[PDB]
């Protein structure tokens, strides 16, 4: 029926944070402390519009 909208790899290429489990878990309190002030913008984006392929920015 209706065609889908899949934005391609043009916008789907950002270098990942390729650290492992334990380092990311043990760095968590400072990670949420200083940064993660603008990720609640991302989470509010995600909960106000539940359509990832929107909050890519």
């Amino acid at each position: 029926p209706g065609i889908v909208e899949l934005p391609s790899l043009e916008d789907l290429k950002v270098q990942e944070v390729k650290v492992s489990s334990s380092v990311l878990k043990a760095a968590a309190h400072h990670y949420g402390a200083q940064c993660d002030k603008p990720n609640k913008e991302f989470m509010l984006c995600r909960w106000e519009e539940k359509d990832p392929r929107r909050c890519l920015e």
């Binding site: 990311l24 968590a28 309190h29 990670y31 949420g32 993660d36 989470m43």
Partner: protein, 68 residues
């Protein structure tokens, strides 16, 4: 002389009493020391559980800050 097997002038007596010490604690004392150690274990249990809940809340906060 004659060499039978007599008793030599009479021997010592041997008891015939049901010799029972019935030692150990009473009802009240054993009861109270058991309940006292029970309540000691309860108090230490309460302390460890609430400090453990503090740490488990810290683990929850770790997964919260990790997620997005």
């Amino acid at each position: 002389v004659k060499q039978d097997m007599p008793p030599v002038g009479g021997y010592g007596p041997i008891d015939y009493k049901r010799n029972l010490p019935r030692r150990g604690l009473s009802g009240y004392s054993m009861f109270a020391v058991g309940i006292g150690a029970l309540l000691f274990g309860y108090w230490s249990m309460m302390r460890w559980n609430r400090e453990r809940r503090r740490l488990q809340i810290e683990d929850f906060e770790a997964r919260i800050a990790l997620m997005p």
